[PDB]
Amino acid sequence: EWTGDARDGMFSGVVITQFHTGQIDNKPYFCIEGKQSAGSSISACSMKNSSVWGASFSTLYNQALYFYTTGQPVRIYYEPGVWTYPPFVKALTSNALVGLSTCTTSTECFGPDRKKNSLE
Amino acid sequence: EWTGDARDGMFSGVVITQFHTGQIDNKPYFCIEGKQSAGSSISACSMKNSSVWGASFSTLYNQALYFYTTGQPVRIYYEPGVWTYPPFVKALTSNALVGLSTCTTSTECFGPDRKKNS
Amino acid sequence: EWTGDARDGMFSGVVITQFHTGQIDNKPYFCIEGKQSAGSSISACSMKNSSVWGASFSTLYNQALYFYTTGQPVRIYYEPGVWTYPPFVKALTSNALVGLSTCTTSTECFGPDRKK
Amino acid sequence: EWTGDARDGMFSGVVITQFHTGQIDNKPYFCIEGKQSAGSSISACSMKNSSVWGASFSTLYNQALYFYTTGQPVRIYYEPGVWTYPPFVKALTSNALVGLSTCTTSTECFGPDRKKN
């Protein structure tokens, strides 16, 4: 796996506006909400020792809390459908947080593009 | 278990105004206290490596101290009746701290609702 | 053992004004000193991996530095007679730091009484 | 091995202006980019538990985020050729981050020289 895999998805120039932290199944997690330009919302959660993105929990937590504090526009890298518990998915999101980057514009950010390739 | 189980409880739009840290039975703990606009006070404590909610000690301490620092209104998610040493319950609370969220209003905050079914 | 056991002692309305960190017998420790309201000093140290209060070293370090930084009046919970190495006691203190609270007045602070 | 080995290489007097974090092959990593006075560019990544430089990840993350926050000119010590996965290299860099220093001028910084001898 890699944050920069050509897969869904990323949102660029996002301001992290909300922060939640809890626990489920003996595992700490946090979820962020951010807004793009345009006033639409992306959510993504990281869970400690989860499946495949669990090893980035500590780094992601510290980084996300940092960017929440600065109010800087950032790129959120996410993977859909990772969380499966239905009440959790309804309240929060199925998206795993898989990475973050600083941005130079609302659309140009540092790091790889996590995006599906196009078909010609 | 889950922070957003349909169980008591949560208080929304709370400013965290008091903070205490200590140790009991070889484990550090912290406790926070806050009031709503309604003047409704809530305390809850988190213990390191405790039975049910100890996995969250480290995140919740970080988050709580962060929110105590900004003074922003937040959601406190708690579970009553967790701590049982009577002198502890008497000076502090039986409430375990089980989650926190930022809020957009005094009633609406980011995160699940934690409340007994209707 | 608990921060709130009916034992000596706590001081309330203390501003943490001094901070020291080092190592003895392969264990990091820190010490803090503060004053008020009268103006009598209180010192207390927390040492990692000691027998009794060692488990709270990293939480108290964090919290103590935080309160050193804000300069707010706090409550210091201590247990005298814990450190026994004589040159350490002479330089610093026998008091173990055992807990910390925010205060609403010079006498009223959040959390238990620790008092005989 | 040592940050101050007489190897390639170091960039002095750079402001850290970009920061990325992610995961690859079960390991968190971060990358930074900095620009010099003269406009010239350096990138470098540190990955947890990976390479001979894995042991420095937490210290380097902390110190890199600190310097990103102050915006002061610093020295980036790096080792070219360490990351080999071609999509990672194309997107980011092959450079491992191997140390950091504060700077007194644009060429004078605190620490060892890391130059090929």
Next chain:
Amino acid sequence: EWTGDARDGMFSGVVITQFHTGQIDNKPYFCIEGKQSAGSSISACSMKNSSVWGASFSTLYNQALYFYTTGQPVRIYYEPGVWTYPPFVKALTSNALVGLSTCTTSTECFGPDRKKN
């Protein structure tokens, strides 16, 4: 061993002005440089998992970075002759950082004395 042993040595009333981080032999370390005024310099380094004083690495890193940020005068407690890799000693120092204290004047600071009898 103890920070406040009657041994070489301490410098009081130091402003920490430089900060370096790197790795040697699979261990992260940091080094600081301060000036007394007075006006002379001291350097000291702490290394994670180092033999005698490595238990202290994480607390000292945090504290030294804090005092670098505030720029307040502090006491550095050090032990000469700990680091022995000659290029390391040449570029940096042999001094191990073994403690830190806040100060009230350029010479009066909280904590033990560390000086030879």
